[PDB]
Design a protein around this ligand. Structure first.
Ligand SMILES: Nc1nc(=O)c2c([nH]1)NC[C@@H]1CN(c3ccc(C(=O)N[C@@H](CCC(=O)O)C(=O)O)cc3)C=[N+]21
Ligand SMILES: Nc1nc(=O)c2c([nH]1)NC[C@@H]1CN(c3ccc(C(=O)N[C@@H](CCC(=O)O)C(=O)O)cc3)C=[N+]21
Lengths: 357, 350
């Protein structure tokens, strides 16, 4: 099939900022380039579009082209007759939204656009709904080819592929998912089909926070079951509230507001009475020790927290499924889709616009 | 001041169900009784109301009375002079709602009602909105004397006191907050003034999930700062999104649905590319090892997950703070507090 990868992968990032060969392994080029080369070796008609093709060293550029990858800077031409479009594009500056919007009217009928490690597919889908409508591209599907790893390293043995599970409205067809599974297995990668909104939580660099919080939830569950002897429903409420609170505080107030509003000293003091079996609570013990030295490891965040003050009120623990359900009864489903869209767009904007020098 | 503590504390739970003297320390009585004794030793006029006072052993009851605590079974009488009413009341059965509603018309002018770990103060305030209006008790304050520990153990060195921070309308006055700070400080306890909605996630037993997830968010931040060299916005975007999804999965589909939908095998495979400095990532390494043995540690949940099927759809990643403000604009603040109350009820009742 005809596949176009948008984004080569910053050669300088993967060698001078993060020493990928030493930290993870393999050899350059890494990123979308490595993905394209793999597809080309498997017999697919691959094109790779990046604005900085000319900056690629000849030695690297020859390897890619010798695989069968056509290199170009023209995103529009690259999209023509493409069945699969993989966005290995920047999170910053809305670049992933802009590129997807540019290529939208030129993709072949029933094409599928795929996000990777830099963007969640539903957020992209939210940004594109007006373009989709005006251009009549309701045939375009939306899913993912999330390497959940750096392509080109030995750890990349898989792709996370977004499905429609848990979605009120589908974003991808079975025919489109099958093409993504084919690209994965054709290149010896295992396909993990995941509900669309779980792809980025599982696959992104933030798997660090996803996994720690998941294992931490399980640890609390065991303490609740074995030591406290409390009810399952109370345990689940506490887990959901904790994680919703942290998410909402980071969303609205960032890490500085998270630290100031929860109050580390209060958390430390409170946690002492939930260290009930040190041997069975390795995460609790470590967390309590990390909190004790927090002023030494993140002094810049502590300083920002001292100077933080919440300018707007909020509720941090309101479960999103309840808010969505209540909203379904207050307004039409047509209106609700717009509200969910604007909420995903505002999430991206508020978080990326907050980062001010 | 005049303080009334509602609830002695389950003598049975703190010895037979949970061995507090061994696991934590101290000696009985634990709970509301220990709090009342501390206030009385600080010179306050303390009253403790409980329907099962006569079921308290004589040796323990004498210790409490000798400190100056007046024991009674009449909740209404105990409220008539109480400037501060602390609800050391049960977890289930709506007993806290029942007690708070019964004493509301009898509390002194400008009195403050305080919940502990068994009830979010915002949930109680929401429940009582109609009673506050019909009884004309808009002067009554609502806060917490949350011990975030078992009173009577050496770990109880503090109180979490709910404030109006993050609220759109006040639930307590500064004068009332000062009274609670004094009660804490008079008994040698540190007063932690937190936004009302954060007292539960910081003080309750869920502090385990709050602290670990918080620490894991900081660990990722340090990794992004020192190793990945990525921007703060991307780090925050991924934290908020990840914890939003996990939260929604637990709320709507339970722990069984979380395990089935998230895919532990995918998580383990993904996490391999983010263990970039084992010494700087103690939580990541520990979490990665715990994920490998999950089938052994929680087999009953694995069996529930294998039989789980999502019956209804929901957008697990819809950002809660954004939806909160959309709801506020449509139907106002009381409905949002009502949602917090509806959430609490589903899991603490029936
Ligand atoms: N399970 C897992 N998932 C990952 O996604 C993953 C991983 N492990 N191991 C670590 C590598 C490294 N990595 C980066 C992605 C984007 C930028 C990045 O900064 N991108 C900028 C572009 C900077 C620019 O060139 O303008 C942006 O999208 O805004 C950096 C690093 C993902 N990784
Ligand atoms: N920072 C902190 N906050 C706490 O809230 C905290 C703590 N540390 N350390 C330990 C105590 C103990 N604890 C219990 C939780 C649930 C039940 C519970 O579910 N009891 C049920 C059932 C009792 C039974 O088993 O019969 C009930 O009272 O209805 C009991 C006790 C939380 N604690």
């Amino acid at each position: 099939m005809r596949v176009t990868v948008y984004g080569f992968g910053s050669l300088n990032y993967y060698s001078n900022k993060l020493n990928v060969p030493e930290k993870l392994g393999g050899e350059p080029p890494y990123g979308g380039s490595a993905m394209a080369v793999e597809f080309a070796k498997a017999g697919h008609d691959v094109t790779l579009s990046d604005p900085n093709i000319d900056k690629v060293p000849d030695e690297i550029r020859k390897k890619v082209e010798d695989a069968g990858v056509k290199l170009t800077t023209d995103d529009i031409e690259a999209a023509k007759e493409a069945e699969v479009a993989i966005l290995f594009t920047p999170f910053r500056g809305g670049v992933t939204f802009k590129i997807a919007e540019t290529i939208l009217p030129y993709l072949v009928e029933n094409a599928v656009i795929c996000t990777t490690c830099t963007m969640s597919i539903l957020v992209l889908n939210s940004y594109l709904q007006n373009a989709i409508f005006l251009e009549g591209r309701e045939d375009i599907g939306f899913s993912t080819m999330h390497p959940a790893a750096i392509p080109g390293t030995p750890q990349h043995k898989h792709y996370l592929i977004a499905t429609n599970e848990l979605l009120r409205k589908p974003i991808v067809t079975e025919e489109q998912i099958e093409k993504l599974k084919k690209l994965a297995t054709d290149t010896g990668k295992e396909a993990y089909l995941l509900p669309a909104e779980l792809v980025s939580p599982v696959g992104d660099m933030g798997i660090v926070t996803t996994a720690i919080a998941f294992a931490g939830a399980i640890e609390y569950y065991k303490v609740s079951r074995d030591i406290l002897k409390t009810k399952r429903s109370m345990t689940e409420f506490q887990i959901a509230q904790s994680l919703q609170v942290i998410s909402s505080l980071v969303t609205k107030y960032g890490l500085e507001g998270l630290i100031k509003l929860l109050n580390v000293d209060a958390m430390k003091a409170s946690l002492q009475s939930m260290i009930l079996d040190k041997n069975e609570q390795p995460l609790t013990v470590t967390a309590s020790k990390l909190l004790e030295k927090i002023e030494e490891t993140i002094p810049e965040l502590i300083k920002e927290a001292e100077n933080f003050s919440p300018s707007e009120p909020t509720y941090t623990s309101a479960p999103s499924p309840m808010l969505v359900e209540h909203m379904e009864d207050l307004v039409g489903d047509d209106v609700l889709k717009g509200i969910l869209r604007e909420s995903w767009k505002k999430f991206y904007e508020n978080v990326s616009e907050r980062n001010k020098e």
